[PDB]
Amino acid sequence: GKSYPTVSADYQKAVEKAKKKLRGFIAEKRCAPLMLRLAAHSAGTFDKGTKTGGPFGTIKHPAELAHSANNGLDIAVRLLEPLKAEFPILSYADFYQLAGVVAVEVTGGPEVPFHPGREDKPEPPPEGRLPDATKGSDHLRDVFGKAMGLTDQDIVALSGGHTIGAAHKERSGFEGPWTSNPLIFDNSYFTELLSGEKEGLLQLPSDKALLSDPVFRPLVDKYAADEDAFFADYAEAHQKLSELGFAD
Ligand SMILES: C=CC1=C(C)/C(=C/c2[nH]c(Cc3[nH]c(Cc4[nH]c(OC(C)(C)C)c(C)c4C=C)c(C)c3CCC(=O)O)c(CCC(=O)O)c2C)NC1=O
Ligand SMILES: [Fe+3]
Ligand code: NA
């Protein structure tokens, strides 16, 4: 359903150079998970019915950073500002989505296709569109399905993004990594979810909801058994998420 806009050759050159600078920066700073969260949070405010929110640069606004669900993302925005300044031609919207794609790549994940041309929009979406980690499958479908327009497959695949990173008691209140290797992108999020709760690892109520849902569970099983299948479905879902409201 996508018709990607034309951008100048200079814009394309900047995308390519910024991608490389982002790899080095994100790897050195060890901030891939935070950058993936920034990109996803960013994108996850899209409401299909109204065509509002989405990955349009608004997360840099103090007003959106102040949203409770975005606790700690001000760190991400600050970290990227010096690099962003080297690429004045790029929209923030594109830059943050490129950072999310790079975060996945430099931790060993799939190569998520990237298309430039998102415009920076003036108005942040209203607060309260991002999902509540204490809720379950009905809520997940309300947010990913009814608002964003993503599929049940996309929900489970994207949940696997938690294979990198950790919660912080000072941010959400939850604490700790989902996996034993929080800077490695692999299917361990699903392996861990299946094995039960191991000491030192985190499972949110929203993660556990995947295990008991008739549609979500076979997907968890598939991804735990087949990392290639996870990578394919993840790449599809991340691309879709990063393009919500963009190019149709
Ligand atoms: C399925 C719904 C879902 C919920 C409710 C969710 C909630 C959630 N996600 C994160 C961290 C968190 N989330 C993510 C990727 C992420 N998150 C996300 O869901 C949203 C909300 C965007 C829809 C998507 C679609 C993606 C990527 C594909 C990373 C990489 C980290 C680690 C951050 C770090 O290490 O600092 C925290 C801890 C924040 C903190 O305390 O530092 C919480 C409470 N994440 C979820 O996926
Ligand atoms: Fe998350
Ligand atoms: Na991992």
Coordinates of C-alpha atoms in Angstrom, one line a residue, residues 19-40 72-83 95-108 161 163-166 168 171 182-185 238:
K19 CA 23.4 5.3 8.6
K20 CA 27.2 4.6 8.9
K21 CA 27.7 7.3 11.6
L22 CA 24.7 5.9 13.5
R23 CA 26.3 2.4 13.5
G24 CA 29.5 3.6 15.0
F25 CA 27.8 5.9 17.5
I26 CA 25.2 3.4 18.7
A27 CA 27.7 0.6 19.0
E28 CA 30.2 2.7 20.9
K29 CA 27.5 4.2 23.3
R30 CA 25.9 0.8 23.9
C31 CA 22.5 2.5 23.4
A32 CA 20.9 0.3 20.7
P33 CA 18.0 -0.7 23.0
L34 CA 17.2 2.9 24.0
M35 CA 17.3 3.9 20.3
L36 CA 15.0 1.1 19.3
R37 CA 12.6 2.2 22.0
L38 CA 12.8 5.8 20.8
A39 CA 12.0 4.8 17.2
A40 CA 9.1 2.5 18.3
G72 CA 14.0 8.2 29.8
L73 CA 13.6 8.9 26.1
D74 CA 14.9 12.5 26.7
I75 CA 18.3 10.7 27.1
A76 CA 17.9 9.2 23.6
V77 CA 17.0 12.6 22.0
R78 CA 20.0 14.3 23.7
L79 CA 22.4 11.6 22.7
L80 CA 21.4 12.0 19.0
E81 CA 21.4 15.8 18.8
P82 CA 25.1 16.2 18.0
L83 CA 25.0 13.6 15.2
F95 CA 16.7 10.3 11.5
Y96 CA 15.0 8.6 14.5
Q97 CA 13.6 5.8 12.3
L98 CA 17.0 5.3 10.8
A99 CA 18.4 5.1 14.3
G100 CA 15.9 2.3 15.2
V101 CA 16.8 0.4 12.0
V102 CA 20.5 0.7 12.8
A103 CA 19.9 -0.3 16.5
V104 CA 18.5 -3.6 15.2
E105 CA 21.3 -4.1 12.7
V106 CA 24.3 -3.5 15.0
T107 CA 23.0 -5.9 17.6
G108 CA 22.8 -8.6 15.0
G161 CA 12.2 -6.4 20.1
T163 CA 15.3 -9.3 23.1
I164 CA 17.5 -6.2 23.5
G165 CA 17.5 -3.9 26.5
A166 CA 16.0 -3.7 29.9
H168 CA 14.6 0.6 34.8
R171 CA 11.7 4.9 34.2
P182 CA 20.6 -7.6 26.3
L183 CA 22.8 -6.2 23.5
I184 CA 22.3 -9.2 21.2
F185 CA 19.3 -9.4 18.8
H238 CA 9.4 -3.1 12.2

